[PDB]
């Protein structure tokens, strides 16, 4: 708490020495994300979603929709997500900041609920801006380390998965409805493998939803299992699908970035995540090493 | 794309400027400039002053006028604004004459549409908002009536809610007479007339009820 205070004051005086003890999750340390160690992963991107509708005056009026708290565990694949009922916005105004607060609040509550063993050690956050209030609501318990990811992971597009979005719309109240973000994959292979596939999928979605869905529903014979979020494929067709997705990502890169052809290996890997930034000194480090 | 203003006066543009001038007058050059997506305020005003204003003239000079001009040149050396004034002409034209003597559409249509739209829209936001509220209010009223009428048809008589009175001494004018300033006391007798008018009134009410 006192460190937070000093850091807060320091921010107030714009003298913040950018010095961290633990390095960020860059594309190199991505491997050492998980290491027989209980973790949790957080995204606050789709907490405050809005219906843009016209008014009588003619100007835009933003209205809140139900959202989520993307709360994933890469080992078990247990995606918690407390579905944000619009009722919680109805209380207050200045909702972009309040989104962060409710997020961190909810996360904190969740952590409190779980036991000292299952209290996750290193909590990773997508939005580095949403770290700031989390630090505050994580002051309940000091052992839970925070990890500001250098590598941006696509979890805005995570909520544009069919069944997820469905469930979000369905939500009538302050409720959470957890899922296993990958089930069959765990059964077949280790968690990391599953996560790579997932990462690819979410990535593709982020580039383009229509393309993603098309890829998923290219074959209509395949069927998405009642529990599972994803369509259960055989591993070779699965492989093919993955490849296709990758091509989609690369295609997107080619379109926007205009330099997806002459990529180095590590660099290419970074590009897939879209996380390893050019200015990020971690990347320079890994590169330097090789 | 944002950029630095200038260029050349396309005839459509000129016409637009003229229209603006008619509208806003010769001293609000900012607004007129705004109306033209290409041309500046200063540019516009200059143009109006120099070329576009109808109380200038571009008719050729008579021999006497030529004499006056060249004499002025001889006497006032190249103070051409002064010279122009003396002539009663715009200066550039005068200079040119003196010299003589000595020897895309989509964009344009966009600004047009916008222009005409503006010029035919001559009210501050307060006005627009007010009329909007008026029509909305009217709509609301008719909807309310439809409910009330519907209920009447249905057999439930609902009296229309009063306007939620803004202040303690706010008036409903149907309650009782506004500020009955009575007629001047009767010299000629008025009794029969009072009766007849009363009957007419009551009859009218009856008619309305039946209507």
């Amino acid at each position: 708490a006192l460190y937070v205070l000093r850091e807060r004051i320091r921010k107030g005086l714009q003298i913040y020495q950018s010095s961290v003890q633990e390095p960020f999750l860059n594309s190199s340390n991505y491997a050492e994300l998980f290491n027989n160690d209980i973790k949790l992963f957080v995204d606050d991107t789709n907490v405050y979603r809005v219906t843009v509708h016209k008014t009588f005056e003619g100007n835009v009026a933003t209205k809140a929709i139900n959202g989520c708290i993307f709360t994933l565990n890469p080992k078990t694949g247990h995606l918690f997500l407390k579905i944000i009922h619009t009722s919680v916005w109805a209380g207050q105004k200045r909702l972009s900041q309040l989104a962060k607060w409710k997020t961190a609040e909810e996360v904190s509550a969740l952590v409190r609920s779980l036991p000292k063993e299952e209290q996750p050690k290193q909590i990773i956050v997508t939005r580095k801006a949403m770290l700031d209030p989390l630090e505050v609501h994580m002051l309940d318990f000091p052992n839970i380390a925070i990890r500001p990811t250098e590598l941006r992971l696509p979890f805005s597009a995570a909520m544009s998965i069919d069944k997820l979005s469905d469930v979000v719309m369905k939500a009538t109240e302050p409720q959470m409805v957890l899922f296993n973000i990958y089930d069959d994959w765990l059964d077949r292979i280790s968690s990391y493998t599953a996560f790579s596939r997932l990462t690819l999928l979410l990535r593709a979605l982020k580039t383009n939803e229509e393309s993603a869905k098309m890829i998923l529903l290219s074959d209509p014979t395949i069927t998405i299992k009642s529990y599972h979020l994803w369509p259960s494929f055989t591993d070779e067709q699965w492989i093919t699908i993955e490849s296709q997705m990758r091509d989609l990502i690369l295609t997107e890169y080619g379109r926007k970035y205009n330099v997806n052809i002459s990529a180095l290996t590590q660099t290419e890997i970074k590009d897939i995540i879209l996380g390893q930034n050019i200015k990020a000194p971690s990347v320079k480090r890994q590169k330097m090493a090789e | 794309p944002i950029y630095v203003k200038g260029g050349v006066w396309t005839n459509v543009e000129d016409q637009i400027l003229k229209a603006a001038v008619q509208k806003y007058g010769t001293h609000q050059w900012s607004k007129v400039a705004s109306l033209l997506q290409k041309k500046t305020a200063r540019q516009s005003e200059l143009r109006w002053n120099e070329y576009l204003n109808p109380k200038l003239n571009f008719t050729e000079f008579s021999k006497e006028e030529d004499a006056q001009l060249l004499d002025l040149a001889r006497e006032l050396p190249n103070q051409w604004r002064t010279i122009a004034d003396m002539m009663a002409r715009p200066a550039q034209v005068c200079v040119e004459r003196y010299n003589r003597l000595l020897e895309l559409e989509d964009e344009e249509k966009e600004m047009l549409a916008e222009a005409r739209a503006r010029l035919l829209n001559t009210q501050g936001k307060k006005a627009t908002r007010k009329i909007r509220e008026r029509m909305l209010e009217e709509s609301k009223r008719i909807a309310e009536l439809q409910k009330r009428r519907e209920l009447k048809q249905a057999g439930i008589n609902v009296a229309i809610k009063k306007p939620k009175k803004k202040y303690g001494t706010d008036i409903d004018y149907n309650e009782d007479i506004v500020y009955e300033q009575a007629p001047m006391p009767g010299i000629y007798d008025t009794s029969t007339e009072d009766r007849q008018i009363k009957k007419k009134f009551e009859q009218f009410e009856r008619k309305v009820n039946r209507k």
Binding site: - | G168, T169, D170, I171, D172, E175, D176, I177, V178, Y179, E180, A182, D194, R195, K198
Partner: protein, 141 residues
């Protein structure tokens, strides 16, 4: 303003004592008709009578209706104002009402006017009152 008009209280109301001692609070209430300050007068009818009688309405209002200021009854006949207006409407005429405007601003305005209402014009001049009475009597038979 100055206490120019005197209070308009009737007899029955006031009680049969040769000398009562009443008090006047000036600017002492809004009236019961026109929401308008006036000199509130009040008195116990007897010394040991528990019920005070306070002058409900203002003097202008009283004059206007041509009534008592405590009873709200006509000062002549000691009867309800509406009733007397009905009686007057019946004899000599067909229509005599005394419409009070039920809107808080307008009532004030009306009160301000120095003009008698329907029945009040009859009952003010005693001759006319008498005439009305005899006509009423005639109507009876």
């Amino acid at each position: 303003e100055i206490n120019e008009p005197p209070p308009n209280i009737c007899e029955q109301c006031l009680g049969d004592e040769a000398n009562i001692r009443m008090t006047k609070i000036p600017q002492g209430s809004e009236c019961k008709i026109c929401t308008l300050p006036f000199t509130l007068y009040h008195f116990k009818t007897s010394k040991r009578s528990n019920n005070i009688i306070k002058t409900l309405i203002c003097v202008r209002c009283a004059t206007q209706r041509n009534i008592c200021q405590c009873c709200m009854l006509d000062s002549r006949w000691h009867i309800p104002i509406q009733l007397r207006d009905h009686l007057i409407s019946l004899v000599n005429e067909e229509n005599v009402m005394t419409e009070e405007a039920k809107n808080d601003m307008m009532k004030r305005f009306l009160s301000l006017k120095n003009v008698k209402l329907g029945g009040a014009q009859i009952t003010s001049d005693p001759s006319e009152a008498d005439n009305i009475v005899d006509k009423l009597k005639n109507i009876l038979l």
